[PDB]
Amino acid sequence: DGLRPGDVVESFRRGIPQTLLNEAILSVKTTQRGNCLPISMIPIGTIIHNVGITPVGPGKFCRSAGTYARVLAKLPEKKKAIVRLQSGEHRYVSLEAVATIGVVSNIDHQNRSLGKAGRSRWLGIRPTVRGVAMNKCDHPHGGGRGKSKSNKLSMSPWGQLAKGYKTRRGKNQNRMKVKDRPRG
Amino acid sequence: KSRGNTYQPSTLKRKRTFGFLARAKSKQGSKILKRRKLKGRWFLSH
RNA sequence: UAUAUUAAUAAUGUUAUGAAUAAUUAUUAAUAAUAAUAAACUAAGUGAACUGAAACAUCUAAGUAACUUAAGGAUAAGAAAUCAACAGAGAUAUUAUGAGUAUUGGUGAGAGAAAAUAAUAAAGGUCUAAUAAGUAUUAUGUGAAAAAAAUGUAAGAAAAUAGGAUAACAAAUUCUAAGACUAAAUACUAUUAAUAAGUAUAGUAAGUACCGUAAGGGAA
RNA sequence: UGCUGACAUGAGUAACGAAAAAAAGGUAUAAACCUUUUCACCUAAAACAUAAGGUUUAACUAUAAAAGUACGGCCCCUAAUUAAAUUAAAUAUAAAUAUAUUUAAGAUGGGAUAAUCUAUAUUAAUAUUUAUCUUAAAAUAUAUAAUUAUAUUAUAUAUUAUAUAUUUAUAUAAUAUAAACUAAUAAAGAUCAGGAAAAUUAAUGUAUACCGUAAUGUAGACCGACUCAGGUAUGUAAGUAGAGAAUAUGAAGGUGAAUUAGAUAAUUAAAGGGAAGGAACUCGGCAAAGAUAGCUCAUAAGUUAGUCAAUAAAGAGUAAUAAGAACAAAGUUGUACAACUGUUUACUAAAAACACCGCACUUUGCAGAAACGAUAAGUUUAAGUAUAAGGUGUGAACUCUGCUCCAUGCUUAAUAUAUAAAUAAAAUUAUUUAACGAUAAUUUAAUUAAAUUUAGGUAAAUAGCAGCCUUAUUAUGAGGGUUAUAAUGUAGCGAAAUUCCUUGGCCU
RNA sequence: UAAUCUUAUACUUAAUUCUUAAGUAAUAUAUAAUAUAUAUAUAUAUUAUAUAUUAUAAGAGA
RNA sequence: AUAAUAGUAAAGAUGAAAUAAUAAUAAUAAUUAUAAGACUAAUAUAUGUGAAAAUAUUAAUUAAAUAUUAACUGACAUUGAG
Numbered sequence A: 001d002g003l004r005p006g007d008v009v010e011s012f013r014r015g016i017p018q019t020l021l022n023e024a025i026l027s028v029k030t031t032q033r034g035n036c037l038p039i040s041m042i043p044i045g046t047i048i049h050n051v052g053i054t055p056v057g058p059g060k061f062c063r064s065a066g067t068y069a070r071v072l073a074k075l076p077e078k079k080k081a082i083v084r085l086q087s088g089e090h091r092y093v094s095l096e097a098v099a100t101i102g103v104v105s106n107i108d109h110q111n112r113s114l115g116k117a118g119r120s121r122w123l124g125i126r127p128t129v130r131g132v133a134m135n136k137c138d139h140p141h142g143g144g145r146g147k148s149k150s151n152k153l154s155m156s157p158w159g160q161l162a163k164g165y166k167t168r169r170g171k172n173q174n175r176m177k178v179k180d181r182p183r184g
Numbered sequence B: 001k002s003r004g005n006t007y008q009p010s011t012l013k014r015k016r017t018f019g020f021l022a023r024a025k026s027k028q029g030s031k032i033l034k035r036r037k038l039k040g041r042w043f044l045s046h
Numbered sequence C: 001u002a003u004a005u006u007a008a009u010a011a012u013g014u015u016a017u018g019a020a021u022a023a024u025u026a027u028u029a030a031u032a033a034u035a036a037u038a039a040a041c042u043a044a045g046u047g048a049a050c051u052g053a054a055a056c057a058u059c060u061a062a063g064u065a066a067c068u069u070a071a072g073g074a075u076a077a078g079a080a081a082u083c084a085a086c087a088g089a090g091a092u093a094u095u096a097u098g099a100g101u102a103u104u105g106g107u108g109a110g111a112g113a114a115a116a117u118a119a120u121a122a123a124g125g126u127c128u129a130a131u132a133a134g135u136a137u138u139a140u141g142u143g144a145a146a147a148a149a150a151u152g153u154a155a156g157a158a159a160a161u162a163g164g165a166u167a168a169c170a171a172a173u174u175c176u177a178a179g180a181c182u183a184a185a186u187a188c189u190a191u192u193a194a195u196a197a198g199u200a201u202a203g204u205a206a207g208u209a210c211c212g213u214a215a216g217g218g219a220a
Numbered sequence D: 001u002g003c004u005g006a007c008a009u010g011a012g013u014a015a016c017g018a019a020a021a022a023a024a025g026g027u028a029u030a031a032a033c034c035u036u037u038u039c040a041c042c043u044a045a046a047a048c049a050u051a052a053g054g055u056u057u058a059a060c061u062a063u064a065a066a067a068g069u070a071c072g073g074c075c076c077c078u079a080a081u082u083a084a085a086u087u088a089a090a091u092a093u094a095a096a097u098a099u100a101u102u103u104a105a106g107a108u109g110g111g112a113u114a115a116u117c118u119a120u121a122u123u124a125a126u127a128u129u130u131a132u133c134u135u136a137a138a139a140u141a142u143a144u145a146a147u148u149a150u151a152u153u154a155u156a157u158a159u160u161a162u163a164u165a166u167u168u169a170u171a172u173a174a175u176a177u178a179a180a181c182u183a184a185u186a187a188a189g190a191u192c193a194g195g196a197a198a199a200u201u202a203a204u205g206u207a208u209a210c211c212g213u214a215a216u217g218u219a220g221a222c223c224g225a226c227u228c229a230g231g232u233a234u235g236u237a238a239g240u241a242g243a244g245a246a247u248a249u250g251a252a253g254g255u256g257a258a259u260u261a262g263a264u265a266a267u268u269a270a271a272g273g274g275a276a277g278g279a280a281c282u283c284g285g286c287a288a289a290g291a292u293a294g295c296u297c298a299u300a301a302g303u304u305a306g307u308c309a310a311u312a313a314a315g316a317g318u319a320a321u322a323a324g325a326a327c328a329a330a331g332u333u334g335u336a337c338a339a340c341u342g343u344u345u346a347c348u349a350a351a352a353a354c355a356c357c358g359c360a361c362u363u364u365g366c367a368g369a370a371a372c373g374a375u376a377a378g379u380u381u382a383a384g385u386a387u388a389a390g391g392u393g394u395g396a397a398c399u400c401u402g403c404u405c406c407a408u409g410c411u412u413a414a415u416a417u418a419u420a421a422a423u424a425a426a427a428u429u430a431u432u433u434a435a436c437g438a439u440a441a442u443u444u445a446a447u448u449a450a451a452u453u454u455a456g457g458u459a460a461a462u463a464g465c466a467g468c469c470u471u472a473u474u475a476u477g478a479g480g481g482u483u484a485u486a487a488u489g490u491a492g493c494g495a496a497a498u499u500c501c502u503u504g505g506c507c508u
Numbered sequence E: 001u002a003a004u005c006u007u008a009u010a011c012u013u014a015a016u017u018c019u020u021a022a023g024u025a026a027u028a029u030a031u032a033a034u035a036u037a038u039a040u041a042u043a044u045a046u047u048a049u050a051u052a053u054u055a056u057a058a059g060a061g062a
Numbered sequence F: 001a002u003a004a005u006a007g008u009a010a011a012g013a014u015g016a017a018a019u020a021a022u023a024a025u026a027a028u029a030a031u032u033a034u035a036a037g038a039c040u041a042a043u044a045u046a047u048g049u050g051a052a053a054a055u056a057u058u059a060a061u062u063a064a065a066u067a068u069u070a071a072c073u074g075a076c077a078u079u080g081a082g
């Protein structure tokens, strides 16, 4: 977020090097914004981004503009650390997984308004044709005289319900989630 | 918009699509060639 | 780059100190290469629909068309864990009778054996296996319109004192699975010969002309 | 409405495909061929160069001439993409095949040297898009070093005169139009943030391969069945004029044609003019007519503040007063619908339909959601990570968006609650057996799902928003009492693109 | 958790390379003995015996 | 608000009652442990301070502030539409 040219950032993903070791006391020095480190080092409560899953793999979660996660708890017994992601889903992440300190840049990205259709086209976004505009053969919402919704439940062109229908369900669900994201 | 001129020649494209070697290279094209040979065709491909 | 290397010699000219280093020609020895291959017939895999049932959904069309794969001059099958019925036969293939009979079917449409007796047929019997286990059998899901032998999932035997065969059981009978080979009659193509109440619009050109981007269609 | 062939009929009818021709002569053979002269047409083309294409049509068989420099291919290199190719076991798969990775191919692109003319081999060794302003500098004139006004301002070459290497080289100075245009340079604005891939010295080389080259190419030589007013890529495109590639003309070049000659009724087409009237036409001003500068000024209400409205309407200056080329320029307003620029039925609909930017809902934590995959591996999503991506509705913004979960769904919680397959062992029964046994069914015992039900939640999910009675002198109905329901139409709007009765009543 | 699954990344003999076998050197693990330090247990060093040269790391996990 | 601990059937509310993200999925009360905002008990009298709105947890910075003397200026003041 507040990073500007001239700032200095380290990374303690390998570990605390012999420079800083020779010269908590270390935690406050380390937990400056912009520098990366394992969630074990990152104190409980503080805001982070580019949160990893595994102790070896890269930062996956919380990458987009003005997004962030928050460290909620850490369990050295199970080698996990409960982290709240941007969605609000509380989630187990490996205790030795990587995460940068601070919120992501460009918080005001969301407030941008594209002026015109052409801007969307430039960005690489072709037009969405509504299901109600289509013929019945093309989309369930299609058909009807005048403009009608056909008494048809809001759903995709391939019949998957659009409003509220949980798509990841049953056995195939997320094992690592502690508390599901706030919904509606 | 007047129709009729759907053929728009370009030798290179023709040879890529309908040339002998294109037929030979594909399995389906090889089968076509064989079928034409069986029929008795003088001209198997472009 | 095979009118090639690589090496060994021989002849030629140059470099540096009789010996050494590169190039060109000519012999000798060494090193790799050329898929244009049928089609029909056979076997295997996957497998429609129109259609019929005066509708249609089981059923039918049909294991057909088609696509796919693989083999041989043919392939397949073949010397009974076969049939039969207390008498007997005694390999497989094709045809005639048996017989449109038994059998079976939304018991509709319709489908339909075998034994036995005849031909055709070739010498038609003969070991190649240390005699066969995740096999027979069972449950279950499928499976040639009758008649099974197959098969995914999983339980799973027996030694000839045994095992297979029929709703079931008892008697009897018959055969020996889980190892094998096999001409001949047959299919298709080509050739030769002979016979045509066949063809000159089924009588030789041309898969050409021409049509189509193309698969493909196709004259006189 | 049989098939094939032949021949009729309409009929010597229509038509002969945008078109400017004339004479003389080749030739006592020419409307059509060739030549000469005249006339016309195209001229940012009907010209000249080319690309693609094609029955070589060409100025032709005695036929389209390349080592390379404002020459192309071939070649080297790669993009998009392609590949019976590539890796006891790359992965997946009824077969076919498919996937991932390698390698190979693949131009529409990149590729050293050159008029001083230039040398490509072998061996060895370590670059989206647009812009060039302002300032500043010096130069030229007016006025009294400094002000005012005007052009000029990075590069492109010949001449002359100097200073150094020695008439050939290097540097310096001075001389020298305007308007376009090119390339190469420099600095730099905007978000939409801008390909890929293939070293250098030295020595030794270099006898320079193949293919393209005609003509046609806004067309009679290609794609349209035709010598078809259609379709067809690029570069030059004389001057005069102009803001210009508009428009007029046309230097040069090319062309004047498989139909001609006459006549020009009715009638049709495509044009020109029109008294008096001026929409009386008609479904409807359809069609036609209508431009008192195009430059410089000036330009309102409204408004989302955007000269949006505007190119405002009117109007002014310059020009012209009787007029006297073409081309650009064709009013003002009210309402309905849609924010807008866009898109759409190639060949009857361009719209009020689609899209849109914005708004809202929702799904998915990434070994995700979505889609594709006889079905997989896997691929897109994404080299992204919830301010992201997919799905759904609505459709910029202002003022706003009421009440309702009954139903269909979704969503959360309850052993509330049934039933499917799957199992031990053991009881009668039935069949059989002389007997045990064997074979069938049937019934018992612990451990049961999702579903369903119930109760919430969810309407910018799918959806819904009743009727009767009668009370303030008559009327109206603020009120009052009922039934029904999940709730009972709120704000607004209203004979609406929604109103049948209906040409509703009233006003303009 | 060696069920499953996901992700990432030397010499010598015998039949120039290729493979077998023997012993030796090198590393790792398991077992036994000896010595030393701390609170019957843990750590370090040395010696003997046995095994290995798809792996390691991370994650999910009956 | 979340989590843990142990613990038992009610809890919370009100005039009295119910509805609810209350409670036999184990709460409330209790004890711990994290986080989050927003407020400032006594002193307090708004005493005082500020032009008025205002203004009382602590600290620092910068600004402005009282009285009396000494010296200086010499009416430079008051009020104040717009």
Ligand SMILES: [Mg+2]
Pocket: A127, A128, A129, A130
């Ligand atoms: Mg849309």
Ligand SMILES: [Mg+2]
Pocket: A133, A134, A135
């Ligand atoms: Mg439609």
Ligand SMILES: [Mg+2]
Pocket: A136, A137, A139, A140
């Ligand atoms: Mg549908």
Ligand SMILES: [Mg+2]
Pocket: A146
């Ligand atoms: Mg409607």
Ligand SMILES: [Mg+2]
Pocket: B004
């Ligand atoms: Mg055609």
Ligand SMILES: [Mg+2]
Pocket: none
């Ligand atoms: Mg078959």
Ligand SMILES: [Mg+2]
Pocket: none
């Ligand atoms: Mg029928």
Ligand SMILES: [Mg+2]
Pocket: none
């Ligand atoms: Mg019917």
Ligand SMILES: [Mg+2]
Pocket: C062
């Ligand atoms: Mg059948």
Ligand SMILES: [Mg+2]
Pocket: none
């Ligand atoms: Mg055989």
Ligand SMILES: [Mg+2]
Pocket: none
């Ligand atoms: Mg049959």
Ligand SMILES: [Mg+2]
Pocket: C131, C132
């Ligand atoms: Mg046997």
Ligand SMILES: [Mg+2]
Pocket: C131
């Ligand atoms: Mg046996």
Ligand SMILES: [Mg+2]
Pocket: none
């Ligand atoms: Mg069975």
Ligand SMILES: [Mg+2]
Pocket: none
């Ligand atoms: Mg046998």
Ligand SMILES: [Mg+2]
Pocket: none
């Ligand atoms: Mg055999």
